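Note to self: the last two entries modelled the partners one at a time, which told us nothing about the interface. This time every component goes in together.
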Amino acid sequence: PHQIILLAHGSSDARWCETFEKLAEPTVESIENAAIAYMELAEPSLDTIVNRAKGQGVEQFTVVPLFLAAGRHLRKDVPAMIERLEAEHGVTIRLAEPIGKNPRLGLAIRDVVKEELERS
Amino acid sequence: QPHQIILLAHGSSDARWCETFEKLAEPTVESIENAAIAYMELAEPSLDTIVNRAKGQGVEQFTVVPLFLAAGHLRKDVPAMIERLEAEHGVTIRLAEPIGKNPRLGLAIRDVVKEELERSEH
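The predicted structure of the combined assembly is written out below.
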């Protein structure tokens, strides 16, 4: 049917990857077959997730970027990567906006701030 | 009593980048007293400008909340900036964990992913 993929900047720093794995955990636990993938440096790549899903019958995807913001390079490169994946694997991928554009993140930040004030 | 929150982002000359962070900060800065966004570099206001301003208004106690999903490098640079600002301005600045360490962010992300799934699967 359809699969949702959380796309993070990868890293060779194990601490970075562990932080993102925990960030993705509530989604991965809650939503059927949701997965995190990394643009570079860490496994799994988007290709890896897409190849595995396709083997299981999935040709429709939604990519949710786990980015607070996207600069000029990300704005060009992520959609180019999506087109490349679509063409290579013969699948359809909707690129959602980065999570940093969603008002829920601003609200979460306020909640975190309130927690930090209670500590301070 | 009174405690200044500084939401700390990387800056950029990229307008869209800075706009996104300003919007991320906006519910906090409009909803609670003595809260401001500052940028580590390349954009204003800098951390020094925010500290200088809160200090010029009598604020002596600060907490920096990094607007980062995960820390880099930035593990070294920010503590050294905080030590310098504390000495230069005679203030106390706590460095909080980056927002990405907070379980609240993982839940928010799930909530966004549910909205996107509905959008794609309806």
